[PDB]
Design an enzyme around this catalytic site. Structure first.
Site, PDB file in Angstrom:
ATOM      1  N   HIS D 132       0.813  -1.255   0.057  1.00 22.86           N
ATOM      2  CA  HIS D 132      -0.079   0.044  -0.113  1.00 22.86           C
ATOM      3  C   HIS D 132       0.810   1.298  -0.007  1.00 22.86           C
ATOM      4  CE1 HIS D 132      -3.167   2.726   1.299  1.00 22.86           C
ATOM      5  NE2 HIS D 132      -4.198   1.879   0.723  1.00 22.86           N
ATOM      6  N   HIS D 191      43.215  48.786 -11.946  1.00 18.76           N
ATOM      7  CA  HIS D 191      42.663  49.517 -12.394  1.00 18.76           C
ATOM      8  C   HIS D 191      42.498  49.382 -13.844  1.00 18.76           C
ATOM      9  CE1 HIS D 191      42.491  52.083  -8.525  1.00 18.76           C
ATOM     10  NE2 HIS D 191      43.732  51.614  -8.520  1.00 18.76           N
ATOM     11  N   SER D 321      37.882  29.081 -39.292  1.00 17.92           N
ATOM     12  CA  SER D 321      38.056  29.375 -40.593  1.00 17.92           C
ATOM     13  C   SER D 321      39.639  29.610 -41.201  1.00 17.92           C
ATOM     14  CB  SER D 321      37.213  30.689 -41.053  1.00 17.92           C
ATOM     15  OG  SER D 321      37.238  30.736 -42.305  1.00 17.92           O
ATOM     16  N   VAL D 328      40.259  32.761 -31.841  1.00 14.03           N
ATOM     17  CA  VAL D 328      39.902  31.694 -30.829  1.00 14.03           C
ATOM     18  C   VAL D 328      38.735  32.468 -30.069  1.00 14.03           C
ATOM     19  CG1 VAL D 328      40.115  29.853 -29.148  1.00 14.03           C
ATOM     20  CG2 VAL D 328      41.693  30.476 -30.910  1.00 14.03           C
ATOM     21  N   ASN D 329      37.634  32.307 -30.331  1.00 12.61           N
ATOM     22  CA  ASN D 329      36.609  32.787 -29.293  1.00 12.61           C
ATOM     23  C   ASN D 329      36.383  32.053 -27.906  1.00 12.61           C
ATOM     24  OD1 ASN D 329      35.690  34.939 -31.065  1.00 12.61           O
ATOM     25  ND2 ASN D 329      34.065  33.521 -32.034  1.00 12.61           N
ATOM     26  N   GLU D 334      32.380  32.081 -22.066  1.00 10.51           N
ATOM     27  CA  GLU D 334      31.296  32.602 -22.128  1.00 10.51           C
ATOM     28  C   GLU D 334      30.120  31.526 -21.379  1.00 10.51           C
ATOM     29  OE1 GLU D 334      31.064  33.067 -26.311  1.00 10.51           O
ATOM     30  OE2 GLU D 334      32.366  34.600 -26.286  1.00 10.51           O
TER      31      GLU D 334
END
Lengths: 466, 466, 466, 466
Positions: D132, D191, D321, D328-329, D334
């Site tokens: 049950h 800075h 490419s 290079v990203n 990200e």
């Protein structure tokens, strides 16, 4: 890397990669899945569908500009229509937590539409012929101006078709209850303490006004979202697109959607920042703040059945127990208030991500639209569920409402002009000390008869100015 | 309790209390100071001044309605004008962290205006004669509908007179720089990587567009703030005010301020919730998100003088060292970005407080207006300071801008249509491998002369569509 | 620039500047006031006092290292002691919204201590002789490693001396009430609905446990704060300080404060990031989350006097009205819950600012410590005020508590083992339908006598396991 | 309601409902799916698995206490083991946005384990025999003390097995890079401006120290999470459970998991509040603040290839490419920084939800654990992905590092002790004005020979104290 299912070979500039044969994505989508398997969050399907709209509009534009042959245009349009209808959503596997420009999902759309178009032409999937994902499906577009266009299309359509109708519809249930309750007088509560009366209709009118104002704030977002980034290309200048593409593709998107999409007047802000989506989320945050309060009033007023407030009765939808009659947990209020807490957190995330743009491109685009659509769907779905399973069934517990009204001490100031402040204060102090009603104390002190009390204290004369 | 300075005796319903003789507040303000000495945050003076406006308008209204004698009205108006001009701000000592309805600051205004009016009449301060703080200065008003009226007056005036002009003025400095820089071609940056060119004017145009949009979002808040709670009295019904008071007092407030204040159409929402102020803060949050990005672009572009980006030069305002020429820390950018972080936190606080209303009254009113005015003054002051001491003096470092433009590899795609993709890619690969320019690699490989390169690669032809 | 008061001439590398004669700051503080007049927020005085501690410790260290002559050391120590005691706080006018390294407030400390030391020596203020603000007061220190040291000193001292004692003391008032209420049985409430009983002591024990856990979380922050940045100099390397300075200055700071300050094992993380202060604020956020709930339980349980819950009675501290007996607005709960909303917003600001470090220096230092000390003082002050004016005076309304206990339907399951589920459910359903008690329904149905009901339903046997 | 697939009839107290034949859930899960179809968020599978652990431990406890027959215990244990192994996750369809106590997911576990156990016994699914869902699988447990137990089990296991190992492993990659880079001297940046030097190893040591501190903060959460609510039953008193159940079930959970789970010392705080989970999320927020900074340093230092900073080189993982060599990203940076923004928003949501407890039960439990596990998985997955595809491959661009080091003006203070401040400042001013190096200016002015300059300016002597 491996796949139990049969695969086909696809290629990109890094070489060959195997792609499941029954999927329409291509080399770059498959390869990226291997590098951005973060979390469980798949890019929201509204973004996928908006990519379908964009790619259809782009094909029609490039056809009109003489750049794209009619036979290739027709095939791309057919496949892009399937994408925009949601018929190919299982072919969009990429997560939110990807390239911050959203270029990976742009390429997912190009590859799916290319391979489905190739199939419609009877060609070989993966061959990029007769429909090339970059040279045809991405023609006149860039890696950077496509995902922000999908973001605005998705958000504007979702506002118009899903969120605003859900809020309007909940408002009109509260207004119908307001009308039904306009003659029920109840005790006010300020600081949680007993206060002078108002009608239950007046109190519900506050919720109606809150929702009306929220509808207006959400509508005011839309003109910003109708402006589209498409045509800004890599950095906003439009280098390497047709001089007419930006305006014509927005014209086609407006025609497809029957919404007034236009090209963004400043492509640099459109790529480098996303305050329209911060604003969209902020308006949703104002709705979460209103709904938290409304849902809390409903569950507090219905709390009981005997040791809470108990002025309202809500419907029970989960199974109860015959040994617990009268008990109703306010589970729609609980889901809604949890949603509202989530929306306030999502609003913090959206503002942080938007603040982090650099130079020509904000590269927090997926997390921004993810939170906008998450909050939107939670709010719209909870409005609809709360409406159907709670608000429509709200009823007054008239004996409890009436008990509070006539046993509160707060009606005593109705006596001042007849017997003076001193005698009125004596009645209230005796009622409080002796745990009896104001009327019983007035009689007990011999200051008023019961008939005099009823003539002088009329709650229906206490809910408006003189 | 004790005071070094001479005191006078004042009274409230809890008995006698000593009040400094040179202060105009009364018994309840003094007594409350003893119970709510939390933090250092004094109620913002804009709220105090708005109380002056409200109490003047109330006196003029009650005079016109025949309730307030002319001689008492004149005295209250005179004292309330001093309050609204800021001349009595040292007599408003209460902290933000008080009664959540703001009733304590309402009573601070009543007591100050009463005691100053008594002094103008030549009477005894503390005697409540001939001007009673409750019976005259608070006539027709309540403990609950006065502070929310002050909130909206303060916020609407501050938006109009301080924040919106500060943002407009910063926008027009960026627009003037945009025009000055319209012919300076620089390298784009996307994902922080070198990208195709745009003019410095185009990049500044993005900031101009961001600020324009923020101005519009801030303006769109104002109609909500012009609606005033005054007249709702204790719970929203208007019980125990004159039937004309709500409309007439707003008419007088509109005349005093020359802004279109009106009575709120729904007094229940006006007392029970504060989404207009959530919206006001949300629009300020969108400005903080834009300013964070703009300030960060300026300090990154000016970073150096030799090992950062160095495309811009900013003014130096703190003393430097003759042994560190060229070094300028971007301290206005630092103050601004710190302000922006504060505004995003304040926005979280405002939404949380607004979500916590119960029944007829939201009792988080002081913290809501405190954050609205804190964010507003930080944003307006930092806009003004950043404008004067940084933005107005931004200059290009043209030799650095030009160096990047002609030494980036990203201009190579201008060659494709003349020599083909393969030869263009060979030039780029050789330039990268040999650490030389694209022009030097093209010559070295014998593919182009220098004159051919200069004819084919014209950055001024690379900042717009074909 | 001008000053009504007499001025003296001071000099920095930008030239002459007039400084009020009665102030101890110098040229750079005055000049910076002209450029960073943002908001109203003056740097928190705990930071000023911590600068006094640092500069005293630095002078003693430089004396021990043979770098600083004894006569100059003695003068600097004397002036720095006045700073650390708060005796010179009117000479620290700079705002939070300054240089993001906090160097401007470091120079404010150097100039004040120099000019006060010059005065103690009988010299000419502004002459930098015989005590030079940079050459002597800042000896062996840098512009970048001084403010973060002041941040950690200020936060650690405030945790130990102010916040932790305030929370401990509130915990022990709730524990004393817990003990006083240990035999008072009341109805539980879950989902806001009536539930099985618990003692009022058990419910207060939850608050005691929440506060105990918060005390522990706040204590666990302290070891991170005891690590000090002093000695990292400009970028973390210790260039241009003595090889023993970092360790010896921390030794002196530990001796001055009698707290176990030590030099930070990694100076690069100590300058480039501030997660110890994010953690300090996060622990305060957990306290705000607990206090919001505790304060809300108290005001809900005391709501009334007649139409709310009404199980508790709280003290009234603002003047009431003899015509409103029994009414007590929970104003300490309101101030506390507003503080809690502020702390949750401040926590968002602190995390955002900390996330924004770049390379060798996080330049969001002032806003981080501003929020830490703001939240700390609000929480500590509200704990103390809520304790004195609410918690210490909480009393039970025993007749109301008892009414709910014996009129709830929830005690019916005590009958199951005697009469079975079916008969128990019948009693509950009849009680609910007829608006009578469980005992009255059992008698009415002839199922139990009143004596049988009282034998079978004993709330004192329903507050623990079998 | 309808199902294309075959269904079986199940029953609850509201009647019959059809349930898909191939699913193990029961009437109440199916019925609830109809009322809480909000959003897309399915209850996290870690919570489902933790329910498996709890129900196994409960069965073993109830067997040991003599309450549950051995044959039923064995069947429940077998099915609960399948749940805890994730083998039945497709049978848990309920969303996060459900009953705020999580009782609906508790009943989902009871129904699945009951029906799978019935199948193992050869019985009829839906018959509640021989197992049950309430009488056996939920034996000795309540609707309110089960989900909070699952929350703590899930969070503690995920901290130990997933998050902490991911952070430790990323720390040791940064430490290995630190060691590899210990002799590479680079220019500091404070800075964003050029500053005195440090080694690349020293700068990476800051990241290592940040991650070490985060590991410690995450570990310090665990003792709070090991305390379990099971045994508090409905309101915390333990009414209607066995006096030994709370301790014995935690003993069994500790044995199953090999983690030191214990019963919570205060069940009232354990049900009414969730500060342990606020603390768990706050420690994750500190990690997000550190990771945002670390990821940003990596992408800024690698920005280029020619017009950014360019001191580092990161691996390229998406196709590039051949016409864009060197570009290079930083896509792992990200994804990570987007995750960090999400975690800061999720932290706001968790604190808001926790602050909203009332009386004996906080009914925001699902949204609290949803955000904890969402942030945890995002952080752990992004750490692992960033480690594999970015951090492990970080390399120095030594020619660029060296160029900055020897062309910065900041090394000039090495000359002061040899030629004096004036001559050193003259060298720096001439270098800056003439756009030449410090060494070239010193030679040009005839102040130093090149050999004298090289003797006096040794960067390897400029990275530590004297």
């Amino acid at each position: 890397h491996h796949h139990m299912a049969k695969t086909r070979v696809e290629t990109d500039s890094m070489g060959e990669i195997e792609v499941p044969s029954d999927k329409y994505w291509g080399a770059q989508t498959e390869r990226s899945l291997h590098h951005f398997n973060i979390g469980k969050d798949i890019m929201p399907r509204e973004v996928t569908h908006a990519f379908g709209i964009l790619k259809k509009a782009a094909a029609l534009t490039n056809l009109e500009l003489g750049k794209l042959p009619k036979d290739k245009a027709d095939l791309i349009v057919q496949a892009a229509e399937e994408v925009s209808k949601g018929l190919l959503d299982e072919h969009f596997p990429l997560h939110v937590w990807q390239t911050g420009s959203g270029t990976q999902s742009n390429m997912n759309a190009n590859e799916v539409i290319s391979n489905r178009a190739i199939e419609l032409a009877g060609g070989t999937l993966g061959s990029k012929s007769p429909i090339h994902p970059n040279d045809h499906v991405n023609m006149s577009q860039s890696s950077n101006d496509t995902f922000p266009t999908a973001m605005h299309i998705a958000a504007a359509i979702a506002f118009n078709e899903k969120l605003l109708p859900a809020v309007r519809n909940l408002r009109h249930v509260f207004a119908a209850k307001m009308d039904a309750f306009k003659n029920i007088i109840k005790i006010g509560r300020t600081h949680l303490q007993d206060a002078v009366p108002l009608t239950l209709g007046q109190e519900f009118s506050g919720y109606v006004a809150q929702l009306d104002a929220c509808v207006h704030r959400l509508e005011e977002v839309l003109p910003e979202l109708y402006e589209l980034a498409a045509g800004g290309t890599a950095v906003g200048t439009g280098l390497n697109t047709h001089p007419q593409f930006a305006v014509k593709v927005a014209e086609h998107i407006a025609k497809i959607t029957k919404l007034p999409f236009v090209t963004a007047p400043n492509k640099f802000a459109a790529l480098a920042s996303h305050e329209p989506l911060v604003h969209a989320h902020g308006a949703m945050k104002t709705l979460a703040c209103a709904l938290m309060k409304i849902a809390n009033d409903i569950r507090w007023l219905a709390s009981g059945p005997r040791c809470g407030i108990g002025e309202l009765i809500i419907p029970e939808n989960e199974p109860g127990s015959s040994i617990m009659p009268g008990k109703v947990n306010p589970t729609q209020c609980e889901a809604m208030t949890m949603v509202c807490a989530q929306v306030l957190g999502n609003d913090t995330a959206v503002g942080i991500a938007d603040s982090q743009g650099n130079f020509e491109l904000n590269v927090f685009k997926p997390v921004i639209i993810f939170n906008v659509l998450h909050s939107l769907n939670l709010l719209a779905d909870s409005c609809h569920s709360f409406q159907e399973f709670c608000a429509e069934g709200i009823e007054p517990n008239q004996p409890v409402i009436d008990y509070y009204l006539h046993h509160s001490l707060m009606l005593v100031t109705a006596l001042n002009q007849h017997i003076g402040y001193d005698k009125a204060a004596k009645i209230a102090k005796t009622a409080h000390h002796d745990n009896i009603s104001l009327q019983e104390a007035a009689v007990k002190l011999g200051i008023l008869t019961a008939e005099q009390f009823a003539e002088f204290v009329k709650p229906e004369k206490m809910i408006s100015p003189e």
